[PDB]
Design a protein around this ligand. Structure first.
Ligand SMILES: N[C@@H]1[C@@H](O)[C@H](O)[C@@H](CO)O[C@H]1O
Ligand SMILES: N[C@@H]1[C@@H](O)[C@H](O)[C@@H](CO)O[C@H]1O
Lengths: 786, 786
């Protein structure tokens, strides 16, 4: 019967592509007598999909007693919820754990398991962890754990199976665990896991060492005199060799990988819909290890992501967050496009901030499609409450500003979700259209680890949160400079992939593998344009001296140590052509050789070198997002792009108008956004076409986003452009939305006349085109083709 | 001829009270041909005062080479700027340093001084500080530094004296240095200052010790066996008695005080206008030591404050900030009102955030008058540029989103400043009206120091930023529960002052002085109502066992250590009557004895006692601002208020409508604000009135604030209430502003009928009270009395 398939960027249900617009309704945390009303409110919001966990400890409250029908509590009626969601026309994404996070007791793991079998608990290097901590960590690969999970799955899997879309029910995907990260302990490298199955002679650590390295390799890599693998003790402090620390991290990722494989093999045998997972490891760059392991073991897993930015404070989704969002969507889509599964955000923050400003929510949600993710689930969409004994992180409450309250109230971001869902499910060709940046950023996994840890040994700081990702990060600068970027894994990426970009930015610390340094050399030599900062690498992956990149480039970068104490971090000024005293923070390194292009006083601190038809810019400083009237940071980006020949497909008159062109075959949708949120006006050019023509500019009165059609066609009729979002085109009626100003300009080919409702034509022109300006007193208006 | 006096809350100029509405125009950073136009823009904003620094290193670029007239650079023409400001009818606040901060090179200190005399530099405990750090720190009491400062003052003081308001010029105050804080090093207790003049035998530390304590005292306080003061070496680490660390902190404050007095003695000789200072120490609760010092040396200094919340990122002035602003305004006005000088914010952030949302700016600024500060200077008001060689923190730019840009453009918070300043200068009786809370918080200065350091030696955590001050702090919870509060210094406050409140909240750590413990006992014995959390003190100021408060209360509190590792900090649920599973964080202590009122499972963790004539609520947990549908943290505050009989003078139907009553002699103004910013509707009860009567609730559509008149009158005519701000009443014309909804209700007594302009009457009633509901299409409308 029913079919759930996938192609390109979408799931395909019974042979029709569908864009997922989902809300999370955790049935087990919402009164059963309210489920139907709340699903009707999701219908009203334009959602086609419902996401829910299934919690082990909820449905098996005592060992051996399973309740999926509401026999012991009406909120244990999984069966009834799945039947109701189906009757009401929803797809279901189901997430049966065992771990479900969810701010729920033990993340779904039963106390009766942990209390009876404390030997499964993960341990610290000096003994047990405390027991009153949230989500008690567990040693994944302990057989007693796995056996118990298997018994959970044996109960719940037959219910899932019966209700799969392929069997006449609603369920379209089953997810593995929940963002498995060692129970949110991977961030702290010596908190976990020292369980004896790991650390004993012949234990998992020793076996993993033996599978990955020769003993001699480890003697050289860790600078040790080992006579047997059993002599290489688990690390317990930052005084141990950095290579060994990196290995300990990757060992943990390996154990998570084995756990995920174990679950996958059970799910794959039982279910013929897509098997999914959310944010493996709670890392991003380290996904390289996940996708490689999937390929190695033929695991057909659909990896999904999430976007969370504010917890237990008001929302804070403004221009500051763009760097991080661009980075995360970038590295996500790099891997998922190569796996061939649809990009999807299974958790898109809609709760857990105390007050969610609708314009900030709009910015977050609406930037996901141009950044490659058109399939979006809002979490938590339906507010709830925690049954007694199942509280964890919020006490009784599970309604922290959800779009629909526990009482059925509608909060302001409900209407944001509704408007964007209508567009995403209805606008022809939008989901399939793709941003195609001219620029890439090169990410390097080991640095993610170091940032996670706050590692301090090196010449350069590991505060990549500050210099790359955050409110002043380089990535935020690139976004706000109107420089869209792909993100690539520097170890995995091919030369041909790199050379597909006009400019590659690489942030370097002291060390960089031989394989990556040599690759960058080849990139440049073959015509690539590099920007590298704030130093060149001096060491390889083993911390042994190695500098092929630097030697090829023919410059020299002074040695200087970056500072960590905020009071001691310098405030310095760098000048360049057309750039008088641009602020830079922290230690600045002289760059000798090549053509000097930036200066700290009379000292060169950035240089340009050409090699064949390629080039490199080497900066001895951290370039960050700062803005002002003078706006030198943005200007410097633009000067580097001009130096290396980078030309975007679009131009703007107002630098605060951020444009992301979503290109399809013969058409595009330009996402046009105002992240700063102050009123802005300007013109845009796309591939040489300047818009608007009759209006003085596109006006965006506040923070928000438009998806402007360029070349969207049906038959012989084309929307050459519009300054309003084309929400849908049904028969001969075009529905447009412009919630950011009171007028819109539309340019049409192939039609002689129109009738407008919800507004008045106040201006127009041509033979070439039917151009009209419509004043509309609301957000929505319709143009009927005659 | 002119006189500058002061009474109450206001400076009194030529016999008349004036409300200060200022902007900073740092003439030295603004092109001289724009000064006039910028000052005229300030007059359009309703500003009556201009603030500026005078920079030593700018007007003395070489030793002995002074320029105050533009003889060497047009922006050195201080004299010309003062004449201009005077011609244009501005008051001037002048701030001649020597330190001026200002994101300016060395904070104003000449390089030729530091380069010739490095012996004046502050030292670290291990060696010199680095030379390339911002604001090179200086040993204030080094005779070579003070000689140099004296020469600066011998040059600029005659200029300032000529231009004093008392001598026919515009200058109404001269400020001392700038927030002297040991050059932003006081926060790190072991970064500074180990200059030999401090640390040597017979040096400033040893002399301070001997002035403050006997040797016998120090043996007790430090648990030591010293036979000489020379054995008591300066601390360089936390492996010192905690009292000794507190004394090292206080000794630095004393050095700052000495520096201030040295400056003050020179100024007082020269100047007969108020001598002012901004935020001594960059601390708040430590102001006790500054006011005590003022008293002890008979210094007449006017202490002013500042409000800054976002740096080098977008503004973020939402509900999360209210706890800190209530705290800081509270402790400021506690001290300043005892001093008898006017409350004034000399720097009210209007720049240095990348984009300032006007609603967030309005919340920041408009909350100051109801929190006791009607005199406000907006910094930086006029955007500028730094002369070459004088950059520090921003490179070339000094225009980071100022209200007036470098090019004279207006940014969106200009209009917010204009509208507030027009109201503060025109609304009769507004500036003199006073908040009179029912509740106070008791602040304890040693705990401020421990929060600065992140001190780890105690049972309780010193993370007061988290538990008291910040986004989830207790003080934000108080503010958002509609509980205005005063903030009192526990050490200084009299019993009489305490007993004037209906409830006192005290956050306690392990130790609390015998004086303060005993004062708390007396307070409850004499009828006071105490709330104390999350423990009772077990030690006195010398860390010897001392538990007078506990002993009097007759409770016992479990001993448990609070956690610092975020992964290990507990999430727990506390219940009470009406309160099912309210979230708490971190360790929870049983409280045995008294009437149990709060429970962790079956364990009492909060008790209520009645002792002497008063009462005390003792909580073994940290109460924080979390919100949700259930809203249990606000509800718990409400329950405790009820328990102890605390009744505000107002009631409100919407708990997000925050109300601060400003009480006058025969009238009041109710500040009504929407800090969360989502649209809110509600009704207010106040002064026996219901507001509104006809209109369907007061609507605040977005973040912002109204000052609603109650009882404002001229002769027989009285505004009983209105739901718009009364900005001015001139002749028979009342001018109202409601920029937060499109309808307002007015209630007048003594007048039979009115004429409206700017709106239409859409409902009304009479008889002893004329009530009209006006629909207005703009923010302002007028009511003329007939
Ligand atoms: N998958 C988790 C959710 O289960 C949790 O509810 C959400 C908010 O903390 O964080 C995401 O990482
Ligand atoms: N008095 C300083 C100012 O001089 C500075 O310009 C402002 C912004 O950082 O902070 C205050 O603390």
């Amino acid at each position: 019967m029913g079919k759930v398939e996938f192609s390109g960027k979408r799931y395909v249900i019974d042979g029709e592509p569908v864009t997922i617009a989902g809300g999370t309704l955790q049935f087990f945390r919402v009164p059963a007598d309210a489920w139907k009303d709340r699903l009707l409110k999701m219908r009203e919001a334009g959602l086609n999909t419902v996401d829910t966990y299934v919690a082990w400890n909820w449905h098996e409250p005592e060992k051996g007693s399973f309740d999926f029908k509401g026999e012991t509590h009406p909120q244990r009626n999984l069966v009834g919820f799945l039947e109701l969601a189906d009757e009401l026309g929803f797809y279901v994404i189901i997430r049966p754990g065992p771990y479900i996070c969810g701010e729920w007791r033990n993340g779904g793991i039963p106390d009766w398991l942990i209390d009876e079998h404390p030997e499964i608990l993960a341990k610290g290097p000096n003994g047990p962890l405390p027991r009153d901590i949230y989500y008690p960590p567990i040693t994944y690969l302990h057989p007693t754990y796995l056996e118990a999970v298997g018994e959970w799955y044996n109960a719940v899997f037959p219910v899932i199976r019966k209700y799969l879309y392929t069997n006449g029910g609603p369920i379209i995907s089953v997810s593995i665990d929940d963002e498995p990260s060692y129970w949110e302990t991977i961030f702290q490298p010596f908190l976990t896991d020292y369980n004896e199955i790991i650390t004993k002679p012949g234990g998992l650590w020793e076996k993993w060492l033996e599978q990955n390295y020769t003993l001699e390799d480890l003697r050289r890599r860790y600078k040790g005199d080992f006579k047997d693998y059993s002599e290489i003790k688990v690390p317990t402090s930052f005084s141990e060799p950095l290579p060994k620390l990196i290995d300990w991290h990757h060992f943990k990722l390996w154990m998570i990988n084995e756990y995920v494989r174990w679950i996958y093999e059970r799910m794959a045998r039982e279910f013929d819909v897509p098997i999914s997972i959310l944010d493996p490891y709670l890392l991003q760059v380290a996904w390289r290890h996940f996708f490689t392991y999937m390929r190695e073991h033929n695991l057909k897993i659909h990896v999904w992501t999430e976007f969370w930015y504010s917890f237990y404070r008001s929302s804070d989704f403004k221009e500051d967050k763009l760097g991080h969002i661009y980075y995360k969507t970038g590295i996500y889509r790099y891997h998922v496009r190569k796996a061939g599964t649809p990009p999807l955000s299974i958790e898109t923050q809609s709760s857990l901030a105390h007050t969610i400003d609708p314009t900030e929510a709009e910015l977050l949600y609406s930037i996901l499609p141009p950044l490659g993710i058109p399939n979006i689930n809002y979490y938590l969409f339906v507010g709830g409450e925690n049954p007694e004994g199942y509280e964890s992180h919020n006490g009784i409450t599970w309604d922290v500003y959800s779009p629909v309250g526990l009482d059925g109230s509608e909060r302001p971001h409900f209407g944001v979700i509704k408007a964007l869902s209508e567009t995403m499910t209805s606008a022809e060709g939008l989901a399939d259209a793709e941003l195609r940046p001219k620029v890439a950023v090169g990410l390097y996994e080991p640095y993610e680890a170091l940032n996670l840890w706050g590692y301090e040994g090196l010449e350069e700081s590991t505060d990549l949160n500050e210099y790359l990702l955050g409110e002043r990060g380089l990535f935020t600068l690139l976004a706000m400079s109107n420089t869209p970027f792909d993100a690539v894994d520097l170890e995995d990426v091919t030369l041909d992939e790199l050379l597909s970009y006009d400019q590659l930015w690489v942030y370097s610390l002291d060390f960089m593998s031989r394989e990556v340094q040599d690759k960058l050399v080849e990139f440049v030599a073959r015509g690539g344009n590099l920007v590298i900062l704030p130093m060149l690498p001096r060491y390889d992956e083993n911390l042994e001296p190695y500098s092929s990149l630097k030697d090829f480039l023919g410059v020299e970068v002074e040695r200087e140590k970056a500072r960590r104490n905020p009071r001691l971090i310098q405030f310095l000024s760098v000048s360049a052509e057309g750039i008088d005293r641009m602020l830079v923070r922290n230690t600045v390194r002289g760059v000798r050789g090549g053509e000097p292009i930036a200066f700290l006083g009379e000292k060169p601190v950035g240089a340009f070198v050409r090699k064949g038809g390629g080039s490199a810019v080497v900066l001895g400083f951290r370039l960050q997002y700062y803005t002002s009237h003078h706006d030198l940071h943005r200007k410097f980006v633009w000067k580097l792009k001009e130096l290396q020949g980078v030309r975007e497909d679009f131009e703007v008159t107002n630098p605060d108008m951020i444009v992301l062109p979503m290109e399809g075959k013969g058409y595009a949708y330009l996402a046009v956004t105002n992240p700063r949120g102050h009123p802005i006006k300007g013109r845009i050019s796309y591939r040489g076409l300047e818009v608007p023509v009759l209006l003085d500019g596109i006006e965006l009165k506040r923070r928000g986003t438009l998806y402007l059609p360029f070349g969207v066609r049906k038959g012989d009729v084309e929307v050459a452009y519009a300054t309003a979002t084309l929400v849908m085109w049904e028969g001969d009626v075009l529905t447009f939305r412009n919630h950011l100003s009171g007028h819109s300009e539309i340019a049409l080919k192939g039609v002689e006349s129109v009738k407008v409702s919800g507004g008045k034509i106040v201006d127009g022109s041509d033979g070439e085109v039917l151009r009209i300006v419509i004043e509309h007193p609301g957000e929505y208006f319709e143009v009927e083709l005659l």
